[model samples]
Target chain A: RGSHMSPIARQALDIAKSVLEHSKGMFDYWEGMLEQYEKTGDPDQANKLRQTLNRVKNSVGRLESALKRAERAYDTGNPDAAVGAVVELIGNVHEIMSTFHELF
Target chain B: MSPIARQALDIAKSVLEHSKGMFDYWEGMLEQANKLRQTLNRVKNSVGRLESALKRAERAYDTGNPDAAVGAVVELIGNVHEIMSTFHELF
Candidate 1:
């Protein structure tokens, strides 16, 4: 079944799978943090955190799109194209944390 | 340089520039952010090396050596994973 795929393509798929899992964990982590902030009862701080969390959510949204693009590229036998999308996905994840860093 | 190599260089440069801005933005948290800046610097270094590797990959591809190109890309992706893992803990 894997006769045609190159090593690079295979490795990229493996990396993307792991990264996507990590991305989900991050989404859940932020959700937990948002819930904790809500429990604190500080409207002002909570509002600011909410803003940051929203930005994180947006980044996650971008990550999902990029991952889908990469997956499609791979399935279509265009792994080189997939590399750019995966890079963008990783970049978005980095930005997500960077934005979250501002809240603290 | 090949189109893909040029594209990779541009992406690396963009990431490096963005890291600088991120460093400046977090100046209030100099201690923690400085630590992050150090890691970002490491990422930049990897990107620089990757740029050179990509250039080599471009040459290899010109000679019909796709494996070399793919190897370089895998290395670049590995560097990216390291960056993500490092920041994942900080936040």
Candidate 2:
């Protein structure tokens, strides 16, 4: 690394935006599915759907929370927090990259 | 003057960095420039003699001469030495 750091911190903003967008959609989908089950009597299907929904909900919640943590990391200019957020951002990049690879 | 040029730029950069978070001093700098210009006269004193000597060394090198390259290098080293000596007087 050079003595100077680049101001490409817009990357953190991108990560925050992705988490917020996906979380809201995923939460809405799961909540709607859960509501559908409640309106009818399909215990077995509802249980299986609930399992997958919980898993996705857990991950979505984690990503949203990580976004907030990263925002604070940027606010304090704490090097350690910046490093952690950078690592997570790289992971998110890899995930998206792999998805593209799978598609093409 | 290769080595001298590098050193001079380094010194200038450090001086600029030191002035950071300090008030600007412009008129005082003109005085410094005037002081620096005096060294040009010292170099000019032997400028004609040095150029004639360097010209011969350049001709010798152009004819694929090894000793000529050595002579040119000696003149360059002397140039650096004079430049460094001038800077020493300043700071």
Candidate 3:
């Protein structure tokens, strides 16, 4: 679909996708921990998880909209806009990963 | 490869290969920076390492050393946060 994109633009999209995969990994880990914390009735860990997950959720919303922007822009032959969307995506990814990664 | 890609790949490869002990050195440097008192010069040095590792990771799929490149990326993804967290407090 992105047959006309420059290699750099293509690479940027690829990195955005990679960032999403990494993002997914963190969510999986977080959700698992949340479930266990709930099952064990560990209110302290559960509270912490909920608090961070809320923040992560907000950031993910930003991340997804930017990603969707990239998808639409790329499809419309707007390479610069497509790449621009990724700049936003990365910022949210940074916030998401910074919070998620620090727990471990 | 695009000239832009070449520029990025060059820097990525250069950082990974140039440290005294290569991969180990990058990790060691970041860990060291994570500990003890934080300094601007010192933080910049380690931040550069993490940034380079990130650049290296994104370009890993196109590199000859895909195996090692991706490994560092995976490790870097999980590891860099704590370093930054410490910086968040230290600074």
Best model per lDDT: 3
Residue A68's C-alpha lDDT in candidate 3?
87
In the range B30-52, model 3's lDDT, one tens digit per residue, is 55653443444455566566666
CAPRI tier for the interface of model 2: incorrect
Ranking by lDDT: 3, 1, 2
User: What is the C-alpha local distance difference test score of each model?
Assistant: 0.56, 0.45, 0.57
The sequence of per-residue lDDT tens digits that candidate 3 reaches over residues A1-104 is: 54332343445445556556667777888798899888987898799889988888888888788888988997897765554565565456566646754676
Which window of 10 residues has the lowest lDDT sum in candidate 2 chain A? A95-104
Pairs of colliding residues, candidate 1: none
> Which pairs of residues clash in candidate 3, taking residues 3 or more apart in a chain or in different chains?
none
Worst 10 residues of 2 chain B by lDDT: B15-24
Question: TM-score, each model?
Answer: 0.43, 0.37, 0.49
TM-score order, best first, reads 3, 1, 2
lDDT of candidate 1 over A73-99, digit per residue (tens): 978978657666755766664565345
Off-target runs (Cα >4 Å) in candidate 3 are A1-6, B1-91
Q: Report the C-alpha displacement of residue A66, candidate 3, in angstroms.
A: 1.0
What is the TM-score of chain A, computed separately for every candidate? 0.64, 0.58, 0.72
| Cα deviation of B86, candidate 3, in Å | 24
- Of the candidates numbered 2 and 3, which has the greater DockQ value? 3
lDDT of 2 by residue, B1-91 (tens): 1232222223323322322211123224533556545655453443433444445555665787655554453453343233333333444
